[PDB]
Structure formats: C-alpha cells, structure tokens
Design a protein around this motif. Structure first.
Motif, short mmCIF file in Angstrom:
data_model
loop_
_atom_site.label_atom_id
_atom_site.label_comp_id
_atom_site.label_asym_id
_atom_site.label_seq_id
_atom_site.Cartn_x
_atom_site.Cartn_y
_atom_site.Cartn_z
N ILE A 125 0.83 -1.20 0.00
CA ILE A 125 0.00 0.00 0.00
C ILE A 125 0.86 1.25 0.00
CG2 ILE A 125 -1.78 1.28 1.23
CD1 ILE A 125 -2.60 -1.37 2.55
N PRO A 126 0.50 2.25 -0.82
CA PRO A 126 1.29 3.48 -0.87
C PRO A 126 1.12 4.26 0.43
CG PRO A 126 -0.72 3.77 -2.09
CD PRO A 126 -0.61 2.30 -1.79
N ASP A 127 1.96 5.26 0.63
CA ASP A 127 1.87 6.06 1.84
C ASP A 127 0.58 6.87 1.81
OD1 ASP A 127 4.53 5.27 2.68
OD2 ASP A 127 5.29 6.67 1.17
N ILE A 128 -0.24 6.69 2.84
CA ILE A 128 -1.49 7.42 2.95
C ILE A 128 -1.21 8.71 3.72
CG2 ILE A 128 -3.82 7.42 3.89
CD1 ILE A 128 -3.74 4.32 3.63
N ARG A 129 -1.59 9.84 3.14
CA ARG A 129 -1.36 11.13 3.78
C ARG A 129 -2.45 11.50 4.77
NH1 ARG A 129 -0.78 14.58 -1.52
NH2 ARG A 129 -2.57 13.21 -1.96
N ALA A 130 -2.08 11.48 6.04
CA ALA A 130 -3.01 11.80 7.12
C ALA A 130 -3.76 13.10 6.88
CB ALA A 130 -2.25 11.87 8.45
N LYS A 131 -5.06 13.07 7.16
CA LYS A 131 -5.93 14.23 7.01
C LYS A 131 -6.05 14.75 5.58
CE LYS A 131 -4.47 15.83 11.61
NZ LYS A 131 -3.88 16.97 12.38
N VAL A 132 -5.41 14.08 4.63
CA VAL A 132 -5.46 14.55 3.24
C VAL A 132 -6.07 13.54 2.27
CG1 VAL A 132 -4.09 15.30 1.27
CG2 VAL A 132 -3.54 16.12 3.57
N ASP A 133 -5.52 12.34 2.24
CA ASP A 133 -6.02 11.32 1.34
C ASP A 133 -7.37 10.73 1.69
OD1 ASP A 133 -4.14 11.12 -0.78
OD2 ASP A 133 -2.73 10.11 0.56
N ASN A 134 -8.13 10.43 0.64
CA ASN A 134 -9.43 9.79 0.78
C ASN A 134 -9.12 8.36 0.37
OD1 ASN A 134 -11.60 12.05 1.10
ND2 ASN A 134 -10.21 12.79 -0.51
N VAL A 135 -9.31 7.43 1.29
CA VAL A 135 -9.03 6.03 1.01
C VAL A 135 -10.30 5.29 0.63
CG1 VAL A 135 -8.11 3.88 1.95
CG2 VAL A 135 -7.10 6.08 2.61
N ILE A 136 -10.24 4.58 -0.49
CA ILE A 136 -11.37 3.81 -0.97
C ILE A 136 -10.95 2.35 -0.95
CG2 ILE A 136 -12.91 3.32 -2.90
CD1 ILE A 136 -12.43 6.12 -3.95
N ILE A 137 -11.62 1.56 -0.12
CA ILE A 137 -11.31 0.14 -0.02
C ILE A 137 -12.36 -0.60 -0.83
CG2 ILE A 137 -10.90 -1.80 1.52
CD1 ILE A 137 -10.63 0.30 3.79
N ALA A 138 -11.91 -1.33 -1.85
CA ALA A 138 -12.83 -2.03 -2.72
C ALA A 138 -12.85 -3.54 -2.55
CB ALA A 138 -12.53 -1.68 -4.17
N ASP A 139 -14.04 -4.08 -2.34
CA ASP A 139 -14.24 -5.52 -2.23
C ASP A 139 -15.70 -5.74 -2.55
OD1 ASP A 139 -13.57 -8.14 -1.92
OD2 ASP A 139 -13.18 -8.06 0.23
N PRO A 140 -15.98 -6.46 -3.65
CA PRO A 140 -17.34 -6.76 -4.10
C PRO A 140 -18.29 -7.29 -3.04
CG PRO A 140 -15.82 -7.31 -5.81
CD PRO A 140 -14.98 -7.02 -4.58
N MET A 141 -17.81 -8.18 -2.18
CA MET A 141 -18.67 -8.78 -1.17
C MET A 141 -18.25 -8.56 0.27
SD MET A 141 -20.85 -10.38 -3.13
CE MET A 141 -21.56 -12.00 -2.69
N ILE A 142 -19.21 -8.21 1.12
CA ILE A 142 -18.95 -8.04 2.54
C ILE A 142 -19.95 -8.95 3.23
CG2 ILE A 142 -18.96 -6.50 4.51
CD1 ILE A 142 -18.39 -4.19 2.57
N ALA A 143 -19.45 -10.06 3.78
CA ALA A 143 -20.30 -11.04 4.45
C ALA A 143 -20.24 -10.87 5.96
CB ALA A 143 -19.86 -12.45 4.05
N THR A 144 -19.22 -11.44 6.60
CA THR A 144 -19.07 -11.31 8.05
C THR A 144 -18.33 -10.01 8.34
OG1 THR A 144 -16.89 -12.37 8.24
CG2 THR A 144 -18.84 -13.81 8.23
N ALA A 145 -17.78 -9.41 7.29
CA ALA A 145 -17.02 -8.17 7.39
C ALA A 145 -15.63 -8.40 7.98
CB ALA A 145 -17.78 -7.14 8.23
N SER A 146 -15.27 -9.66 8.19
CA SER A 146 -13.96 -9.97 8.76
C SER A 146 -12.81 -9.45 7.90
CB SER A 146 -13.82 -11.48 8.95
OG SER A 146 -14.78 -11.97 9.87
#
Ligand code: U5P
Ligand code: U5P
Ligand code: U5P
Ligand code: U5P
Lengths: 215, 208, 215, 208
Positions: A125-146
């Motif tokens: 994962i690239p460096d995420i810039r605190a308070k600046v970057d908008n992170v989008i986590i992509a996963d088609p299915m969320i079942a137990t959310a684990s």
C-alpha cells in the motif's frame, strides 16, 4: 454513513452479476461498470471548491473543482476486487493504488459465521497522507465483514481524511459490524442481503466473487 | 421534462470544458465522460421489469431488467457530439447510431438538414437520444426533432452539456414530452448565437 | 510503402468483422482492437531516439523515446472510422483529432466504379504542423480510394512529416490508386481484397462499415 | 523458445518503466500496455484453423479461427503482475485467472509457495501464461513452474518485462518447451537479487 446505490441501472447490472448463468467475461464487464458508477456516486460526496474559469468568450464564470480527486488511494482486495477497482480507477484517474491479497479460512459449522480468520497473503500500500487522502477500499462482497475489518484496522491508523468502502453486496450483519465500529466510514453498496449461510456466503448473494470473475 | 444534472462531478467536468485553457484532447476526454454520466442518468428514467434470477447459491431472488436498453437510437448532431455519443454508446451498447447535420442558408433563423443517416426508428418502441453538447437558439435541435418526432418513437431524450434558457423553454414548450438532459442552463446568447458564458464553439474546442 | 498486418490474431479479428453474423457491438469491439493493433504496428515505424534513463538501482542505461508520439494528428473519417479511431487513440493518447464526414454518391450496376463522387458533409481538422506532425487518416474501407484521395488532396498541402493511412480492408485497385499517386504514404491495412462489385463495394469485403458498426 | 519483443514501442514503454521518476500510476499504466502487447505477440504464436465466413455481400471467403483463445489460464505471480495480467486478460478474455505467491526463507536461495489459487488446468488442452514483470534469479518462476508443468498443459508461456541472462538460461535449459516472452534481457543481478540495470522492485514501483 451508508450509501445504497440502488437505482434501476445499478440493480439491472447487479441482477446480471447474481445470475448464475452469467459467465466470467460478462461478470467482469458488469463489475467494471459498477466500479465506474460507484466512483461517480462517490465523487458526488467529495468536498469541492467553487472556482472561477474564463471561457473562450472572454467572460468569467463560477465553476467547481473537486480538489480531492487528486488525493485518492484505492485499496484493491485481491482477487475479487480487480474488476471493481478497474472501474473505480476510471472515475479517479489520479488515484494511487494499493493491493491486499486476502483469503478467508473456510468454515462449515452448525451455525452462521459471526467472525472468520482472514489471512493477508500480500500487501503493498502506498503512503497514505493523514488528514489529506481519501481512502477507498474495494471488495465486491462483505459477508461477516472480517476481511474488511482486518483491512480497516490498518487503514484507520493512517488517519486518512476520509474512508470509503465500496462493495456490490453487503450483508445486513456486515454493514452493522462495520458502521457500529467505524460510524464515520462512507460505506457504498448496491444491495444489502439479509443473511449468510453456514459457509459464510451471502444469501441470495452471487457466489464467490473471485471465481465468478476469473473462474 | 427537464433534467439538469448538476452534481459536483458533472459541474467539475463542465468547468474543465468551459475553461479556455483546456485543449482539444482534454476537452474530448471530458465530453466522453459526460456522455457516460448522462447515459447513466438517462438509464435511471427508463421503464424496467421485475424478473427472477437464481444465484450460484441455488436460491432464487428478485432482480431488475431494463428491456428498454435493447431499443435505443442515438443521433449524433454534427459539430462536437462524436465524443458525447462515444460515451452514450458505452452506456447503451445495443443502441444503433446515426448522424445528422443542420446548417443555416434570440434567433429563429431557419436551418436545414444538409446530411442525415439515421437507422430505422421503431415507432412506440425505440427511445431516441439526440446528442449535441450545446443548445443555443435551439434552431438545430428543433429542426432535428421535426424529423425525429415523425418516427413516433416511444421516448425522445436530448443530451446536451450547456443549454440556453431560451432554448430550453423553446424546445420543451413545443415538445413537452421530451426528456431534456443538460448539465447547465446558461442565461444568454450573444449577437452571434454563442451561449454566454458558454464554452465557445464546441466544434473548435473538440477538433480544433 | 504498404504494410499489410496479416498476423494470425489480426486475421482472426478480421474474420469476425467479415462475418455477416457479427452484430454491431462485436463489430465495434473488434474494430477497436484492430485500431489498437494497427496503432502498435504504426508506432514501430515512427522515428525514435536513443536516450539515457536512470533506474532505481542508481545506474544509467540506454533507452528509447519515440518523440513523435507527441506529434500525431488523427483524421477520423465519419461515420465508419469512429471505432477504429477509438483504438488508434489508445496507442496515441497525445494525438490531436480531426474529423471529416464523408459519404459516397451511390452508383448502380453499370461498370465497376473506378472513381466516385464523395460528398464531404463535415470537416474540422486541427492545425497540422508542416514537417513535424505525423498525420494518420483512418477509414476501415478503401474501395475506389475516392474518399481517401479527396481527403489526401487537402492533407498533403499541409506538408506533414509523414502521412499514414489506416484501413482494415483495401481493394487491390484502391491500394494502387493511392500509392501510385502518393508513393511516400505509409498505407496500413489488414487485408487487400481483389475486387469491387458494381456498386463500389469491396468483395468479399465486410459490407458498409458504418452500418456494420452502428446499424 | 525465447521471444524477445524489442520493437520500438515496447522499448519506449520499457524506458518509462525503468525511469526512476515514473510514478506508480504511470508505471502501472505502462505495465497494462505491455500486457496487451505481449498478449498480442503471444496470440500470433498460437495454432489456428482455416474457416469460411459469409460476408454481407453474400459471398464466402476464407477466414481464420484461433481455437486456442478458448483455452487459456493466466497465472498472476504476486508482486506486480496485476497490471500485467490486466492487459493479458484483455488479450485473452476467455482466460481463467489464478494467483500464486512465493517467498524466500548470482543467487540460489530457495523460495516457497505461501499462497496459491489457480483454476483447473486441462491437460494437453490449456495454454498457461505465467506473468511476472521481473525474472531475476528465476527461483520464483522455477518454483511456480514446478506445479504448472505437473498439469501437463498444451503449452506454457511466460510473460515478463525484464529477465536476467541468468534466469533466461536457467528456465529454458530446464524447460526447453516453454515460450518465454520478455521485452529486455539484462546482464546481471546484485547481491540482493535485483536486476541491473533493471527497474527496481516492481511491487514498489507499481503500488508504492
Ligand atoms: O458470498 C460471499 C461471501 C464472501 N466472499 C469473499 O469473502 C470476502 C469477505 O467475506 P467476509 O470477510 O466479509 O466474511 C471478500 O473478499 C469476498 O471475496 C465472496 O466472494 N462471496
Ligand atoms: O455557444 C455555442 C452555441 C452554439 N454552438 C453550436 O452551434 C450549433 C447551432 O446551435 P443552435 O443555435 O441551433 O442551438 C449547434 O451545433 C451547437 O452545438 C456552439 O458550439 N457553441
Ligand atoms: O465495401 C465497402 C466500400 C466502401 N465503403 C465506404 O466507402 C468509403 C470508401 O470507398 P471509396 O471512396 O474508397 O470508394 C469508406 O468511407 C467506407 O465507409 C464501405 O463501408 N464498404
Ligand atoms: O530487480 C528485481 C528483481 C526481482 N524482482 C521480483 O522479486 C521476485 C523474485 O524473483 P526471482 O529472484 O525469484 O527471479 C519476483 O516476484 C520479481 O518480480 C523485482 O521486482 N525486481
């Protein structure tokens, strides 16, 4: 915040994805389409500034500039999320990408899974810039959310400006588990299915998203 | 019906289109994006049927089927619609596409169709989508509509990026059943028929 | 010069285009594919320079820079060339585009047409930089070459660095008419069909390219 | 067999990949491009059958059909093959795709497979394409081949961007029947196992 994007066209596409007769090519085609659509919907929730632009007619007029389009990190959860991310990247051409290979430890108990062990076999994962970057986590299915919870435990530490979760189908249990713990996350999904089977699969769901897309 | 699609992202894209510094490559890129977006917005106004599908889990569940997606004719008004139509065609892969050009020989100057090649339109079945990034005096759009309305299509959609208040009112007053989609409605037209603030001559911006 | 791109995959794709049973969607899809492929083949003929590049390993090494990728003008002959151009633009993302709407005055059975009247109903071409720009004229079919010759008459006056003509199918007659008059044009095609019928259509050809792609 | 695809455009793209100043967005974009190009080049080595097709002109002519396109399994070696495989999958839409990761613990330090999910490979029928932008010691590629060869596929292709002279020789000496496609073959490896001049750690270049 929960954003269920259940408009006619998205439900039409989702129907194609659910259909067990939809082959890999078409499954991927529709998932990319949903990635573009969800990217569009997500874009409309981003902060934006009013700017001034000069047209070829020598006159100035107000315009809009979504500066945050320049500050996006999309986390691709392999294998299933690949087509979804391809579509999302069309919406966010300046997004940097990070990848997480995740696989759940299979189970077949007498009761519906509440939690499941998830092993991350790859992570870059690239460096995420605190308070600046908008992170989008992509996963088609969320079942137990684990899977999502395991990825989130790490992302939250980066203190991003905002966190978006993009799925196609999430279970009622999963959405509850995520938002109750992280109520400020922007969770996007097309449909919320009522339950999971003993194997942790979403019902009605669409099967294993990874296999549906790549066999 | 008037559908002003002024969401943050469409307004962001429009801003790039209006910007005089945006070159033709980036101008066309944004027009394609708007074609896709407007196609998406249009898709959500189409009729749909409830269907049933079986998932791999061996369970049946309710689904949606927009049969109208099979009956679409996209009309490219010649000027700078090629990129707009590229986007719309991505939104409606099953659509047939035609081209039509109108030219002259706060303005009612008569225009005439100099070229036209439109696929057969099925009466009461086809949804016709007419694309033109700019609607100024609306003379061009009205001339094309005169032709299209004859085919008696199920529905007629107009896809534009910037429409003038004058043009919007003139079109929807004459044909109140038309679905006019636009990103912005500008207040005036200058002496030469340009929309102000507008974005200039769309043809020049896209291919100049 | 003539460049016939007849490798297994291009012939496979061309077979789909020829097949009268291939619908509009698949015809466009395959034409886009050929545009990408022809762009790739054209790219390998462009002038290029050897440059030096520093890798992350702290060392410098030889590299290549096809500077002319920045000096391309693609002329899209409507309405049939649209998908072909879409593919070409993937290979030349920095190309400026111009459009020309052309339609041949139809002729009936009399004698196989040697030339035909071409009506140019639309034209908007970017400024072509003499001796610098590489102009690529795209049109899926070259039959009598009447359309191409009419467009070339104007393009040649701009004195571009080089002129490329990209078609899918060209007739033996058409190829001869173009190169005999403009021997320095780079004509790219996938196949050269032997004849034209009495209405100016290429045989066996693939029909009216415009209708095949858009109905 | 060895297939070095060193045409002007692939070398141009390779130059952008090597350039330490090329960010991950552009690095990935170029990898996808090479995936498509290498897929095209691979496609031209497959078997094909002669068929007849009828054109709209009502005449039949000879055509080509590459039946092998229906039987492809693409394996993504985990590191930075996602963009590469994206391009390959565009070239082979009917391909099934799997992933596999190998890790350790001018060099022969052993590697082990820590994760693998690969679709069923049909013996004597499937063409397997193993993708990894970099082949250095080739320990990883050889480890992966150990399992793939057991499936007895019709053919095995390797898709890499830069391969070391050492790795090329090692793989093709052990498995002479493999089709190894690469854009460039670099001369050496350093103590750490990096290819010189190479392009660095592909994983960091693509997702760092
Ligand atoms: O019906 C299902 C349930 C789970 N998953 C996979 O499991 C992960 C999430 O499940 P969970 O961790 O939310 O239980 C996702 O990466 C997804 O690939 C599916 O593909 N289909
Ligand atoms: O500011 C303007 C006004 C009009 N037009 C174009 O001029 C033609 C005439 O439109 P109208 O005056 O008939 O509405 C149409 O193709 C339209 O796109 C522009 O490109 N920019
Ligand atoms: O079999 C044919 C012959 C001609 N054309 C059209 O005619 C033009 C070229 O024919 P010609 O001017 O070379 O005779 C092209 O723009 C193309 O659209 C076809 O579509 N199919
Ligand atoms: O310069 C290099 C050398 C190797 N690798 C990667 O390191 C792993 C080890 O390759 P090998 O030494 O087993 O060939 C592979 O995933 C390969 O892509 C790089 O990213 N860059």
């Amino acid at each position: 915040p929960l954003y269920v994007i259940d408009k006619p066209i998205t439900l039409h596409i989702l129907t194609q994805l659910r259909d067990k007769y939809t082959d890999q090519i078409n499954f991927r085609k529709n998932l990319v389409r949903l990635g573009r659509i969800l990217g569009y919907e997500i874009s409309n929730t981003l902060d934006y500034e009013i700017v001034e632009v000069e047209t070829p007619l020598g006159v100035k007029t107000k315009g809009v500039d979504i500066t945050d389009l320049n500050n996006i990190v999309i986390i691709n959860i392999l294998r299933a999320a690949v087509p979804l991310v391809e579509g999302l990247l069309k919406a966010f051409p300046k997004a940097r990408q990070g990848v997480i290979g995740a696989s759940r430890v299979e189970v077949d108990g007498k009761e519906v899974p509440k939690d499941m062990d998830v092993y991350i076999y790859y992570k870059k994962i690239p460096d995420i810039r605190a308070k600046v970057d908008n992170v989008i986590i992509a996963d088609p299915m969320i079942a137990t959310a684990s899977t999502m919870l395991k990825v989130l435990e790490e992302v939250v530490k980066a203190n991003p400006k905002r966190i978006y979760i993009v799925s196609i189908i999430s279970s009622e249990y999963g959405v509850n588990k995520i938002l109750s713990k992280y109520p400020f996350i922007y969770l996007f999904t097309v449909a919320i299915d009522p339950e999971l089977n003993n194997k942790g699969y979403i019902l009605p769901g669409l099967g294993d998203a990874g296999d549906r897309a790549f066999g």
